[PDB]
Amino acid sequence: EVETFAFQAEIAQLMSLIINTFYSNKEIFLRELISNSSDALDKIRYESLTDPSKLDSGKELHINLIPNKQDRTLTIVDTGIGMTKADLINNLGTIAKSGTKAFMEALQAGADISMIGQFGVGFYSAYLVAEKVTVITKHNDDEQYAWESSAGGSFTVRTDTGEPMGRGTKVILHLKEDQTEYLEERRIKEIVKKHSQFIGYPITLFVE
């Protein structure tokens, strides 16, 4: 069933910094997420070039944005490469120990938080707006897994079976109470237009 792991101490730290530093520009989290999703989609397109079959698990390459106001969650969904259990656990297949260190080191010298994505660590900006993040992922070489954390220094990984999702990754944001603006359709289009306007993949925003 559920394994719990500790974050490496540096990811714990950075996670803490994002949760606790006063920084009004919280919206940059979306860009960061949209920008992990594109990269993920680049990787599967890349691999399929030489191996057509990698798209048996789905030929469609795209990003959906799914707000749900009852659940108070904003789900960012791609049909990219996905993550094996190992990737999930490996920070997130991100180079996070070094990326974090450099990053905090750049934050000494006049970097502000929005540059997070420059360090391979954009993903953790989800915590600018989210109290808990669930990540569902399917990679072609592996089962479907749910990773999850409310920060606090730990994560869980369990296998996930309720709806097979084909191939790719769902990052579910359970929003903090004072951050429900990011479920508003005009708030979300405004963001995508302002930070993600030209991106190599179709972005669909679901309606309620």
Ligand X SMILES: CN(C)c1ncnc2nc[nH]c12
Interface with a copy of itself (CB under 8 A):
22-24, 27, 181, 186-187, 190
Nearer to a copy of itself, 22 or 53 (CB): 22
Give the shortest CB-105-to-a copy of itself separation in angstroms. 21
Nearer to a copy of itself, 143 or 190 (CB): 190
- Cβ-closest residue to ligand X? 40
Picked from a copy of itself, ligand X, none, the partner binding residue 81 (CB below 5 to 8 A depending on kind) is ligand X
Residue 134 CB neighbour total at 10 angstroms: 19
On whether 123 is known to bind a ligand per the annotation, the reply is: yes
Residue with tokens 């084909």: 166
Give the shortest CB-181-to-a copy of itself separation in angstroms. 8
* Six-digit token string for 145: 């897994």
Q: Which amino acid is at 202?
A: P
On whether 22 is known to bind a ligand per the annotation, the reply is: no
The residues pairing with 170 across neighbouring beta strands, listed in sequence order, are: 77, 136
DSSP-derived pairing of the beta strands 73-78 and 168-175: antiparallel
DSSP-derived pairing of the beta strands 73-78 and 63-68: antiparallel
On whether 54 is known to bind a ligand per the annotation, the reply is: no
On whether 206 is known to bind a ligand per the annotation, the reply is: no
DSSP-derived pairing of the beta strands 63-68 and 203-205: parallel
Nearest to 81 by CA among 116, 40, 48, 52: 40
Give the shortest CB-186-to-a copy of itself separation in angstroms. 5
Residues annotated within the binding site are: 36, 78, 97, 123
Residues in binding site for ATP: 36, 78, 97, 123
